[PDB]
Symmetry: D3
Subunit: 157 residues, 6 copies
C-alpha cells in the first residue's frame, strides 16, 4: 500500500516535538502532508507555512500545505487515509479520544494514528514555549534554528 | 419518596447526550427540572429553552425552566434534593468533584448524582458539536431534529 | 417503592461505604447493600463475616437490607427488583473501571440504571485495602471504621 | 512491504482486539498478531489455545499472521522484521502504562515505531478480564467475542 | 542547610488552601518567599500583596513580594533553590509536570517540591471561589477573614 | 538538622530512585532511604538483599542512610525523627495512590510532611516492575540500574 497521511495542527510555531512526530510519520507512510490550520496566534499562516517548510525541507516525503476547512473535509479532499496525532500526556488523551471519534464519524475512511514523541519533547507545547519566550525565558532547545530566529524577531517588535 | 431533581446546564444547544441523561433521570425521579442557565453563546436563553422544551415534550415529568442565580441558589428555591450531573469522561470528573463538593458546601440537602450516557454520546459535547458545525461538519446524528434545523438556520446567517 | 442496590466486596465495610449507603437511603425508598463473595480477591473476611459486620454497621438505617451474593451482580439486581445501581466515586482512577462495569451491567440489564454518589471529603482518600494495610502494621484505623468492624478487624489480625 | 506487529496476551481475543487488528490490516501490508505467553498473568487459556482461537477468529483477514512467543517482545519484533508496533488505546488508565512500554520498547528497538489505534465506541469499555469475569458468573458475553472464542470460553468454564 | 524557597502564584485572592500550603512550607524551609505574580484579575497586585501579607503576618519566616518576570527568572535572582507547588487533584498534575520540567530546563538549581493541602481545601481554587462569590454563593469558609471582607467590598461595587 | 525519609519497596532500586534520593540530599541535611519489607508484594529480592544493593548504590551520597523496616512506615518515620516524607511522582496514575498514602500518613503522624519530587525525564517512564519484566526476558536494562544492582539482577535471574 502507498498510504497518504495528514499531520494537521496550528504549528504556531512548529517545535522540535512536531519535527519528531512528523519524522516518525515519514518513516511509516509513503507521503505525509503537514497541514497547517489557517485559524487560531503569534505567527501568520504564511509565516507558519514558511517556517515548517524550512524545518522539514530535509524530509523528502513531507508536503507542507495550509488549509482552512474542517480538518476532516481537507483530509477527504487530499485522499488521506491516515490522520497523524502526537500523544504527549494523559491530559491531551481525553480530548484526543473525543476528536478521533468525531473525525471517525465525519470521515470513517480516515484512520487516526497516535504517535509518541521522544521523552525529550514529551512535556512541551507550542503554547508553553510561546508563553516562556514571551516572558523572557530561554526556549532555544525546543525549536528548530530557523524558528528560534523568527521567534526572537517576532518578540523584539 | 417523591423526589424533585434538577438537571442544570447551559444546553447550547441541547444534544442527544442531554436527552439521554434527562431521560434516565425521569425514569429514576418523580419530577425533573431541566434548568437552563441564562449565562454563557450560540443560542439565546429563549432559544435554548424553546429547543429543550420541544426536544423533551415527550417526557411527562420534565419541566424546562431558565435560571440566572447560582445553581445551588435556584435548586434550593425549587426544593430540589437531587442534582443530576452527566458523566462522560475522566477529564470532566475532576471538575465534577470540585463542583459537587462546592455544591455540597452551599446546599448540603442537595445530593449530586452522576448518570452515565450511552456509549453513543460518551464522546460528544455541545462545544465540540458547535465547533464542528461552525466549520462545515455534519452533526445531524448528535442533535434532536428541531435542534438540527435551528442550528442550520443559525449558521446560515 | 424505588429499590436500589449498592453492591461491593465490603472487605470490610468502611465509614466511606457507610457514607454512600446513607446518602442512598436519603434518595431511595429501599436500599439493598449487596456483598459479593468475590473469591478472586481472596477476601480477608468470609462472606458470612462481611454480611454480619455490614448488618451491625447499618442497623441504624431502617431501609437498608444487607444480603450476600455469588451470582452475576446484574442477575442478583434483577432478582431483587432493583432499578438503581449505587456506586461510590472516590478517585479518578476507579472512575474508568466504574464506567466499564456500568456499561457491561447496562448490557446485561438495561433497566438497571447506574448512579454514582460522591463520598464526603473525610472518606475520599481511604479504601478497604488501605485500612487493612495500615491495620496489618498495627496503625490506628479507629477513625475509618464502624466500631463493630474495628473490633472485628483487630480480632482477626490478632 | 510494511510489516506491523500487534502483541498482547489475548486471553482470550475479544471483538475489541478484532477491531484493532482489522484497522491495522487496512493500514499495513502484513500484520503479525503476536500472542505473549505471559505466565506471570496466569492466563485462563494456554498459549496454544490462544493462538488457535486467534487464528480462527482472524482467518477472514488475509494479511494477518498469528504467532505465539515467549521472547522479549522487542526481540520478537526485530526477528519478525516488523517496523510498526500496534497497540490499542481504550481508556485513560492504560495510556500511562502503554507509554512506559513504548518508551522501553523504543530503548530496546528504536526502529520499531509504536502506533496506537482507537477501537470503536462499541468495544471501548470491555477487556479480556471483564469478559472473563462476567462469564465466570454465567452472564451473556456473546456480543463481545468471536463465535469460536465464545464457544471455547463456555466450554472452558463448563 | 538554610534553604530559601519560593511559593509563586497569582493569589487572586489568597485562599485558606494557599495559607495551608505556605504554612507547611514554613515548617520545612528556613525562609519562604510568597511571590505574587503581577500578571493575570479581581484584585490589583497591590491589593493581592496587602491581603497576603495580612493573612501570613503570623508566619515569621514568610516574605510577601510581587514579581513580574518569568517565575524562574525571579527565583534565580532571589537565590531560591526550592520551588513550592501545591498539589490538589489529578487534573493539575499534568500541567504541573509540564511546568516543572520547563522550570528545571530554565533553572536546574531550582528544585520543584509538591506539597499536599489538607482534605478541607483539596477541592477549591481561587477561580472557583471567585465564580461562586460573584454569583451570590457563600465562600466565607474558604478565605481568611481579611480576604472575605475585601471580597465582599469588591463585589459590592 | 532536617531529617527526611524516602520509603519504598526498592525491589530493586533503580536509577529513578537514585535520582529522587539525590534530589532529596540536595534539599535536606540527612535522608533515610527506608526499605519496606513488603511481603504482600512477593519481592524478588529479600529485604537484606535490597538494603545491601541500596547501600552500595548510594555510598557516594554522604548524607544517605539505608535502613530496612517492617513497621508501620509512619511509626518508623517518627522513630527516625523524620519530619519530611519523600515520594517520587512519575505518572498520573500513581499520583492518586500517593495522595491516599499521604493523607493516611498525615492522619497517623501529622508532623511528618509529605513532599513529592519529580524525577528527570530520563527515568519518568520506568519502574522496578518494568525493569524486572524486561530482564526476565533477557532484555538489556543496564541503562536503568546502578552497576551493582544490574549485576545482582543478572545473577538472580541466571
Ligand atoms: C472534528 O473536530 C474538528 N476537526 N477539525 C477542526 C478544524 C481544524 C482546522 C481548521 Cl483550519 C478548521 C477546522 C475543528 C475546529 C474540529 C473541532
Ligand atoms: C457551585 O459552583 C457553581 N454553581 N453554579 C454556578 C452557576 C450556574 C448557572 C448560573 Cl445561571 C449561574 C451560576 C456557577 C457559575 C458555579 C461555579
Ligand atoms: C516556566 O513556565 C512559566 N514560568 N513562569 C511564568 C510567569 C509567572 C509569573 C509571572 Cl509575573 C510571569 C511569568 C510563566 C507565564 C510560565 C509559562
Ligand atoms: K468494596
Ligand atoms: K466510596
Ligand atoms: K490483551
Ligand atoms: K483495545
Ligand atoms: K519502590
Ligand atoms: K520516581
Amino acid at each position: 500500500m502507498q498510504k497518504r497521511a495528514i499531520y494537521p495542527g496550528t504549528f504556531d510555531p512548529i517545535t522540535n516535538g512536531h519535527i519528531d512526530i512528523v519524522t516518525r510519520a515519514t518513516q511509516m507512510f509513503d507521503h505525509v502532508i503537514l497541514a497547517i490550520a489557517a485559524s487560531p496566534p503569534m505567527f501568520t499562516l504564511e509565516e507558519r507555512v514558511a517556517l515548517a517548510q524550512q524545518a522539514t525541507a530535509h524530509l523528502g516525503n513531507v508536503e507542507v500545505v495550509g488549509f482552512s476547512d474542517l480538518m476532516a473535509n481537507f483530509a477527504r479532499n487530499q485522499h488521506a487515509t491516515v490522520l497523524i496525532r502526537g500523544l504527549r500526556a494523559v491530559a491531551d488523551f481525553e480530548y484526543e479520544m473525543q476528536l478521533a471519534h468525531m473525525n471517525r464519524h465525519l470521515m470513517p475512511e480516515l484512520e487516526s494514528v497516535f504517535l509518541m514523541p521522544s521523552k525529550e519533547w514529551s512535556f512541551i507545547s507550542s503554547s508553553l514555549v510561546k508563553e516562556v519566550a514571551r516572558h523572557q525565558g530561554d526556549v532555544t532547545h525546543f525549536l528548530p534554528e530557523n524558528v528560534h530566529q523568527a521567534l526572537m524577531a517576532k518578540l523584539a517588535v
